[PDB]
Amino acid sequence: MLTEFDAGYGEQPFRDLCANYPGAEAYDPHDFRIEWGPIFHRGRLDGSARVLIVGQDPAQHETIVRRILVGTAGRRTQGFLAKLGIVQSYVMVNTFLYSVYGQSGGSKHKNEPGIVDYRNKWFKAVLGPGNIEAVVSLGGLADEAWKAWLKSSDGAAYKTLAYQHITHPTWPESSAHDSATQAANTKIMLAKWNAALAALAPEVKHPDVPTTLVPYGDAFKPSELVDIIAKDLPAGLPAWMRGDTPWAVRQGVDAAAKRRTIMITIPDGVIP
């Protein structure tokens, strides 16, 4: 009928934010992939947001879509929020603007003023209206990011919020090699996720659709992997860039080659 899209960052305070973002003076160019520029958010900036997701750092798919959480992690997160009856009314700022280069990480820089101060201005901007009913952090650094926000002047008012530390969507796969232990560490992730949902269900009193909580099983049921909605992607992008199939990856013979190149690859079935 009509196809929805995220107009982007026209309205203040987001215009100045996207107009005045930090570079090498804050993010170390070797430890952070600043070469790809910053990806700022995913979701609503009009106030209709009820849940805030605090993620960790972008990847190759985010680098093309220019929105965060549009890969596997985001697709698992979508379903997580889908269980809360939340289908679009969300906001998702990543901790770090740029991706960590290695597991060396931003954790070497998690308390750097350049990173924290800027991130907090975004926190303040999305929470200002005060329509956020819950907060869900993805992983450890997201947690300390949310905590570091709360110990600040502007953050103190949000200590009563419904924050919830969550394990990082892809811990299973980055923690493990065999697929047995990965599934084993998937079962433990879903368990902790269920705990968080049980904790958050009562506090989200404005869902997009009223839905009674259906807990995760031992593994990811496909119904619980929801494609990113069109309203999240900028004008024109194709629906294969928000689908169930991977379409972006870094390529190179050595670590240097991989850092400079990305390959976009359209899934089979789009072209006749």
Beta bridge partners of 248: 264
Interacting residue ranges for ligand URA, rule: CB under 6 A: 55-59, 62, 68-69, 71, 73, 94, 138, 168
Distance CA(182)–CA(174), nearest Å, equals: 9
Comparing CA positions, the residue from 228, 206, 182, 261 lying closest to residue 80 is 228
Query: Does 111 show up as a binding residue in the annotation?
Result: no
CB of 202 to ligand URA, least distance (A): 26
The total number of residues written for the chain in this structure: 272
57 binds, among a second copy, ligand URA, none (CB under 5 to 8 A by kind): ligand URA
Query: Does 62 show up as a binding residue in the annotation?
Result: yes
- Region for residue 11 given its phi and psi (left: phi exceeds 0; alpha: psi -120 to 50; beta: otherwise): beta
Distance CA(225)–CA(63), nearest Å, equals: 21
Distance (Å) of CA 43 to CA 70, 90, 118, 209: 11, 5, 19, 17
Residue 272 CB contacts under 8 Å (≥ 6 apart), including other chains: none
Does 66 participate in binding a second copy (rule CB under 8 A)? yes
Element (H, E) at 31: none
111 binds, among ligand URA, a second copy, none (CB under 5 to 8 A by kind): none
Does 184 participate in binding a second copy (rule CB under 8 A)? no
166 binds, among ligand URA, a second copy, none (CB under 5 to 8 A by kind): none
Query: Does 25 show up as a binding residue in the annotation?
Result: no
249 binds, among a second copy, ligand URA, none (CB under 5 to 8 A by kind): none
Nearer to ligand URA, 154 or 229 (CB): 229
Binding site members for xanthine? 56-57, 62, 69, 94, 168
Q: Which residues bind a second copy (CB under 8 A)?
A: 2-5, 7-11, 15, 18-21, 29-30, 35-40, 64, 66, 234-238, 240-241, 251, 256, 259-266, 270-272
